[PDB]
Design an enzyme around this catalytic site. Sequence first.
Site, PDB file in Angstrom:
ATOM      1  N   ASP A 181       0.821  -1.178   0.035  1.00 36.54           N
ATOM      2  CA  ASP A 181       0.068   0.018   0.154  1.00 36.54           C
ATOM      3  C   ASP A 181       0.738   1.138  -0.386  1.00 36.54           C
ATOM      4  O   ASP A 181       0.512   2.276  -0.597  1.00 36.54           O
ATOM      5  CB  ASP A 181      -0.969   0.130   1.381  1.00 36.54           C
ATOM      6  CG  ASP A 181      -2.491  -0.707   1.134  1.00 36.54           C
ATOM      7  OD1 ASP A 181      -2.698  -1.500   0.116  1.00 36.54           O
ATOM      8  OD2 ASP A 181      -3.071  -0.522   2.280  1.00 36.54           O
ATOM      9  N   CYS A 215      -2.663   0.599 -13.198  1.00 32.44           N
ATOM     10  CA  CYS A 215      -2.785   0.512 -11.956  1.00 32.44           C
ATOM     11  C   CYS A 215      -4.047   1.222 -11.264  1.00 32.44           C
ATOM     12  O   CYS A 215      -5.058   1.250 -12.202  1.00 32.44           O
ATOM     13  CB  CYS A 215      -1.312   0.929 -11.235  1.00 32.44           C
ATOM     14  SG  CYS A 215      -0.712   2.468 -12.279  1.00 32.44           S
ATOM     15  N   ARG A 221       3.101   2.594 -10.921  1.00 29.39           N
ATOM     16  CA  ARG A 221       3.354   1.104 -11.334  1.00 29.39           C
ATOM     17  C   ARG A 221       3.596   0.815 -12.567  1.00 29.39           C
ATOM     18  O   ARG A 221       4.404  -0.109 -13.037  1.00 29.39           O
ATOM     19  CB  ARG A 221       2.517   0.162 -10.580  1.00 29.39           C
ATOM     20  CG  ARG A 221       2.523   0.561  -8.839  1.00 29.39           C
ATOM     21  CD  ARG A 221       1.377  -0.283  -7.853  1.00 29.39           C
ATOM     22  NE  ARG A 221       1.172   0.325  -6.919  1.00 29.39           N
ATOM     23  CZ  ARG A 221       0.287  -0.133  -5.957  1.00 29.39           C
ATOM     24  NH1 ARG A 221      -0.610  -0.946  -6.454  1.00 29.39           N
ATOM     25  NH2 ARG A 221       0.301   0.491  -4.844  1.00 29.39           N
ATOM     26  N   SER A 222       2.536   1.140 -13.162  1.00 34.59           N
ATOM     27  CA  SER A 222       2.449   0.905 -14.790  1.00 34.59           C
ATOM     28  C   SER A 222       3.458   1.417 -15.810  1.00 34.59           C
ATOM     29  O   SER A 222       4.168   0.863 -16.434  1.00 34.59           O
ATOM     30  CB  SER A 222       1.068   1.578 -15.329  1.00 34.59           C
ATOM     31  OG  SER A 222       0.294   1.043 -15.077  1.00 34.59           O
ATOM     32  N   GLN A 262       6.225   7.802 -10.583  1.00 34.43           N
ATOM     33  CA  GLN A 262       5.515   9.177  -9.742  1.00 34.43           C
ATOM     34  C   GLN A 262       6.442   9.702  -8.598  1.00 34.43           C
ATOM     35  O   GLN A 262       6.165  10.612  -8.098  1.00 34.43           O
ATOM     36  CB  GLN A 262       4.105   8.565  -9.112  1.00 34.43           C
ATOM     37  CG  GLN A 262       3.072   8.523 -10.157  1.00 34.43           C
ATOM     38  CD  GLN A 262       1.702   8.091  -9.532  1.00 34.43           C
ATOM     39  OE1 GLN A 262       1.649   6.719  -9.330  1.00 34.43           O
ATOM     40  NE2 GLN A 262       0.854   8.854  -9.201  1.00 34.43           N
TER      41      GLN A 262
END
Length: 284
Positions: A181, A215, A221-222, A262
């Site tokens: 998370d 994601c 993440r992508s 990110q």
Amino acid sequence: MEMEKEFEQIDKSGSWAAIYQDIRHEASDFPSRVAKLPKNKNRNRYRDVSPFDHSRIKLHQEDNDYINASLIKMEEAQRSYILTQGPLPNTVGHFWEMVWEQKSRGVVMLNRVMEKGSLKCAQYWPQKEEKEMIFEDTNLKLTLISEDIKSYYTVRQLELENLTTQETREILHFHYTTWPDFGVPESPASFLNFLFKVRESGSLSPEHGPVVVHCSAGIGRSGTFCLADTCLLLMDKRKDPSSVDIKKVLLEMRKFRMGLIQTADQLRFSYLAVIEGAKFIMGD
Ligand SMILES: NC(=O)c1ccccc1N1CCCCC1
């Protein structure tokens, strides 16, 4: 400069936040006018994450062709990817229309449906064989065929039927279920194992349409998934694998979708994944 030495130099100097801001400063800025039209407000999960006009995927319908999805075309690597947000309650039918129209074989999902106690994407695939889904708006039927649950990921076989023509196709769903998370994984071993399972399936190969990767926003993440895959393929193809510059590959990919990677922690993790994965590519 061998990225493994660049890596230790940035780590010992603790300059990840500095490298990351340099990428943010040099990144491309292209118009996203279609994403911002008032008719499309409920098709966007995040006000600040939009596809560029020049690279956006168009739906094959006259009514409204808009979906929050981008085509990332990597010319030297000979790989293409579609990066998209997690589907919303109003866009699950559009999502599967895109898979159908683009001839994709695989969908790669890097998030859980609920994270941090909030919904990150809609339950857009069936959870039981006997309870299939019908999208009336796009005229598609989706059936769960089989499910293989592993410690770090789940693979599903899905059948997508175009109810208009009664054609069917097998789609493979690759669901990475253990990204934490907060932050990034401590080791990239499970993420690389997962990347190699997607490759082994045929889903990334040029006989199919581009893989669909998502994601929640489709950038973080992508971004890590496509950046690691492309850098490893270039290290395989080139005479000099040490010429592969991860920062230059990331800026090339940011010509096609904003905001890929990110955080400075996601940038460090992408370097770790490529360095540890190369120890297979170079003959081990
Ligand atoms: N039209 C749909 O998307 C749909 C169709 C059949 C079953 C469920 C469905 N969805 C699931 C997630 C978004 C809200 C409703």
